Amino acid sequence: MRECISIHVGQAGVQIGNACWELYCLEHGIQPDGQMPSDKTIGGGDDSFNTFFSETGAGKHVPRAVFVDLEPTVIDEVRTGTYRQLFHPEQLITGKEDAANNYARGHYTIGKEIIDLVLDRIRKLADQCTGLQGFLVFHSFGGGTGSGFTSLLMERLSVDYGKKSKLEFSIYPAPQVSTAVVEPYNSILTTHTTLEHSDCAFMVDNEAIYDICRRNLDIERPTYTNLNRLISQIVSSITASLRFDGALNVDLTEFQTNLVPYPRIHFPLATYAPVISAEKAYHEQLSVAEITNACFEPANQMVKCDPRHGKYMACCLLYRGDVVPKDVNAAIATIKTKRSIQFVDWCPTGFKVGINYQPPTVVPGGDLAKVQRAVCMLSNTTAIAEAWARLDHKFDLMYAKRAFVHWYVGEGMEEGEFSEAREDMAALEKDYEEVGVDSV
Amino acid sequence: MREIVHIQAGQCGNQIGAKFWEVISDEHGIDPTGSYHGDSDLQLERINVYYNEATGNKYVPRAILVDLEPGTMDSVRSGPFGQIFRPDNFVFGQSGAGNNWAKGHYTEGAELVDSVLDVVRKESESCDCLQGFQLTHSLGGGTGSGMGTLLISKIREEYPDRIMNTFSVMPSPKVSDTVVEPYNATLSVHQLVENTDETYCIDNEALYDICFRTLKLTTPTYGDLNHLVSATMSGVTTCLRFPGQLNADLRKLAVNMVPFPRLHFFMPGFAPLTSRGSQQYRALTVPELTQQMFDSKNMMAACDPRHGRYLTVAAIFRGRMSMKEVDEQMLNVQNKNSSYFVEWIPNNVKTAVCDIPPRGLKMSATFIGNSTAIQELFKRISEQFTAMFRRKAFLHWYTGEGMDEMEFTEAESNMNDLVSEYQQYQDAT
Amino acid sequence: KQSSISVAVRVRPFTEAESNRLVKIDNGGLRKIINVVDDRMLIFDPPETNPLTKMQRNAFPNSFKGSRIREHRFVFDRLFDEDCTQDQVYRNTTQPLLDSVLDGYNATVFAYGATGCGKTHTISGTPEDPGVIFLTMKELYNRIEELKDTKIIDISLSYLEIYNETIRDLLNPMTQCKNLVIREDANNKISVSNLSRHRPNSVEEVMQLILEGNKNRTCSPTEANATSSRSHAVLQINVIQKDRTGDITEEHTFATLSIIDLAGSERAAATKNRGARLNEGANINKSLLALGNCINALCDPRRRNHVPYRDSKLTRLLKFSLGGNCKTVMIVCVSPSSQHYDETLNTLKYADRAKEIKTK
């Protein structure tokens, strides 16, 4: 089987998980109460849902999820809302205050009070899995919980499992928009766990998705629900190969083999090209060539970075719906003809291609329209380093005067660590400057 | 689960607390008798934050009333909501402080502090998890200021790792109902700077100005000012009690607002404030709340933020709204008024959002600023304090209660050091 | 220019039980992360591994798996390498202070270091190899004896400790912490109140007093060591002096020598016990941060407008014992074993914050 375990840390991760599990339940026909009516209607036994659900004897489906937060508010919302009966009752809350936006409180003092329960539940979920593929971790760099508890949890997972894949779907701080003063400290202190433990980290900033919603979907007042729905579409496109048949299936291991050239260069950028409103679903052909070209536009990137200021080291395209390989070949040839999309000289091939026959499913009340075709592009490029550099500058502006440092050192953290993580980030940036240089 | 123990000290603190409990009972649907007659489940989801359950389906607020004279206790008991409080929590003496800090801190308050702390311990040990404490009082007075500082110090000794807010009513330069306001205010600021995490400075002059200008009230009374302070207090702790897109407790605000351990004097404000016959002439949207919040006239502390620089800001919104609008508005405020924000903090504005607006309003927001202009208040107190201390105008009333002039000198030096520290982050660099 | 605050860093020598246990790999393990190049220049975590080329080629743009660089260049006002003994350490570090204390100005010594660093050896030592304190006070009593004529000198010893931002008199226990309050006299003297001031007549009496004070220090078990200390111990020697046969009058001149043994920084180390341990560690870390900020502000000419003395009791107590008038020296003791690797780096970083000498 092809099981994948999803972990949702913090408010951002939990709400992204709400969107993700809404999309999965609608994709597989599972009702919010866990009962799939196709078994009573058709008979069942000819469906593929083990990647995200487990069957009981009664016919109920339990998702393979671990909702964890250090406060009860968001998990209580999940436990009271529509999907109260879907998830297993074991959704972990610390019966205390949350991390309050600092890495130290969520890593050293409060995070170590519920770590054992989380690891025990993950052990129980992994024991039920016969063919476990990897982990999908959702959190936010800027949050206290999403940084500290994520670091602790990934340390424990690397110690225990090690060989299993771990994918990071994180929310990175934006260049200008922010919702906390101490975002740079939390994001910089998360460099170690997202560099040394994670195998492939997907980063997204709200500013880019806000711009996409404003321009593509024609929504002038978007909220976090739309952002979570887009991220859910991305994760669904990533994991579609494990769930449905296709002309060219691409699982997680093949994806990592094709996209990650060196062990440290594992921070690709994600893109969903054919995001359009129902009104603009007409007046557009949305053939494979147009969508593939739309993937490469710097405006459609979900991180505020310009790929034109860097070299595409690798790319993986994952198509869904009515797509033929020859159309994808023509699109890739058209892309390779272009001069503004520059590739490193040591990757002549460049493109990994996967195709799936299951088109995306539209959530009722959502923003995205019903489309015959879709594609998700995941590109390892050197431009992402710029998105880090801005953040580093912010960190310096706060660390010269040691602002807010007393809060961190008062929760079991040494002052020197602040420098060490920064140095690590700097080292990572240097690597992204050294891979892109042309060979002698 | 994030229980707050509320303490009221003095006449001003008791009145503000009575209005605050009226407002919170209205918010959660609690009647004066104590029974719940609401219409939404969410109101009961986090009733435990402020209330304790009681056998006959009752909700007794977790309030502790303190005073050194019984008149205000009788007034609160006879009030519309007086029956909701626990009779055992009414702690009071018989001889007042005489509007003297020494009586309330050393002689008369030291006798009642033991009983108050016994009730405080009894309330605290009933909490599943205690977020912290929440004191309301006025520094310009007698029993309120002295008892508040003494209880702050002793509770900090007993509960060093718990949040300690304080809604202290500063003395105004113009409005002055007492002659010895500077001594009490100085001796209280000397204690608050050492033993608190957040101190929401409030001034009667600013509340009166808000009532006269913003609300266009003809004859404002202490009820209206207490109403404003109640709206502020309810807005601060809104994310503890209701769900939202971005939650923010008291500790999160303490972490974000405070750059250095001594700069924890905040300037509060409430966003939607308009006359009775002028709501129909304005659309209630996020830009309107944003531009009213950062407006100088809306501050409740009698300071001009344009005379200093915002070290940090917090905006706690309530209502259904788009996060893009809030983020864009905060970013626009930061960029347009970049002179009034310190350069060595890339983002001075924290944002939190709640999904449940206050009854009646479609939207609302609460502003908690932290800016250098607050130092002006302390300077004004010094401008009076020295003027009364070189000649020792009313000193014998204080030294007759066991106090020494060394305490006055230490308090003055500490406040001057605080003013200098706030001034250090005003010059561009 | 001069920059009265000075940093001297001492490298501990390997113990016999260390070398044989660790040096096997060279012929845990003996990497010897610390390497002294010059009296103001050292290397932390150098590329001294002989079989390094085979992967140093990969460190270049060939294979990005070990491109991280931990080689740290550190510059300090004074250094003491493995073969340094105690006598010249005393000469270089605390001997000049004895002039200033007798000149009229105060003097201050800090002693910082992590666990297993040799701080106790440096400040106290052994009966056969006396530490810096014994040598300093013996020389002070000697210089009193030479200057006995034409000038009368009195010595007052006090010894307190700071713990959870509360003061405790080590030489007079069962005293409420609320009684020990820090003040500020009009003549720029701190003089914390209700301290049992002793008038020892010899260095042996001073050492006896130090021993009884250390007997009352606050320690706790269940850590990396079962006696690692949880508080900042401050020993103050007030040297009062006046002219014997000259201008015989009530006026006199007095100075203070402060010696501060600092508790090392804390990382909790997953102390499941936690409890007070967390509060103790948080207070220690906050006090260390406040002291570092004060020292950095003093060394920085731009931020001299305001120094955050009020942030902690330790900083407040030494308000007039760190500035330009007072001479400050800081003994940072570090161990060369990799077993304490990260800890040593943290200690070295705390030594670097005093003066950021980027121009090596």
Ligand SMILES: CC(=O)O[C@H]1C(=O)[C@@]2(C)[C@H]([C@H](OC(=O)c3ccccc3)[C@]3(O)C[C@H](OC(=O)[C@H](O)[C@@H](NC(=O)c4ccccc4)c4ccccc4)C(C)=C1C3(C)C)[C@]1(OC(C)=O)CO[C@@H]1C[C@@H]2O
């Ligand atoms: C017809 C209509 O729109 O009625 C409004 C109203 O006219 C206005 C002017 C209200 C009104 O407020 C005042 O006139 C006022 C007077 C003195 C001091 C402070 C306010 C109102 O009284 C206030 C009252 O507010 C509430 O109900 C909130 O829930 C408030 N609670 C209370 O005022 C309260 C009521 C009963 C018992 C205890 C408290 C609240 C605010 C923040 C946090 C929690 C609760 C409302 C809807 C109105 C009236 C009734 C006229 C305003 O109220 C607030 C505090 O937001 C003042 O400007 C706003 C905007 C409103 O438009």
Ligand SMILES: Nc1nc2c(ncn2[C@@H]2O[C@H](COP(=O)(O)OP(=O)(O)OP(=O)(O)O)[C@@H](O)[C@H]2O)c(=O)[nH]1
């Ligand atoms: N895209 C997206 N981002 C979110 C969402 N919710 C919160 N965030 C981001 O999360 C950041 C704040 O950190 P949080 O993750 O909410 O903090 P936390 O994980 O709850 O941990 P605590 O600070 O202890 O509460 C903000 O900058 C938001 O941009 C969401 O629903 N969608």
Ligand SMILES: Nc1ncnc2c1ncn2[C@@H]1O[C@H](COP(=O)(O)OP(=O)(O)NP(=O)(O)O)[C@@H](O)[C@H]1O
């Ligand atoms: N300069 C030195 N010459 C010889 N031996 C030394 C020297 N410095 C330290 N040692 C020895 O190294 C060991 C560790 O030093 P020591 O002074 O005991 O640290 P410690 O105080 O026991 N650890 P801690 O209590 O956490 O500070 C002891 O056996 C010392 O005798």
Ligand SMILES: Nc1nc2c(ncn2[C@@H]2O[C@H](COP(=O)(O)OP(=O)(O)O)[C@@H](O)[C@H]2O)c(=O)[nH]1
């Ligand atoms: N907001 C408000 N302020 C008050 C009230 N009563 C007094 N004050 C202010 O508090 C000061 C007097 O303090 P007081 O309450 O008498 O102190 P106490 O006598 O020790 O309890 C005056 O300067 C007033 O400005 C009140 O009911 N509401």
Ligand SMILES: [Mg+2]
């Ligand atoms: Mg949270």
Ligand SMILES: [Mg+2]
């Ligand atoms: Mg020892």
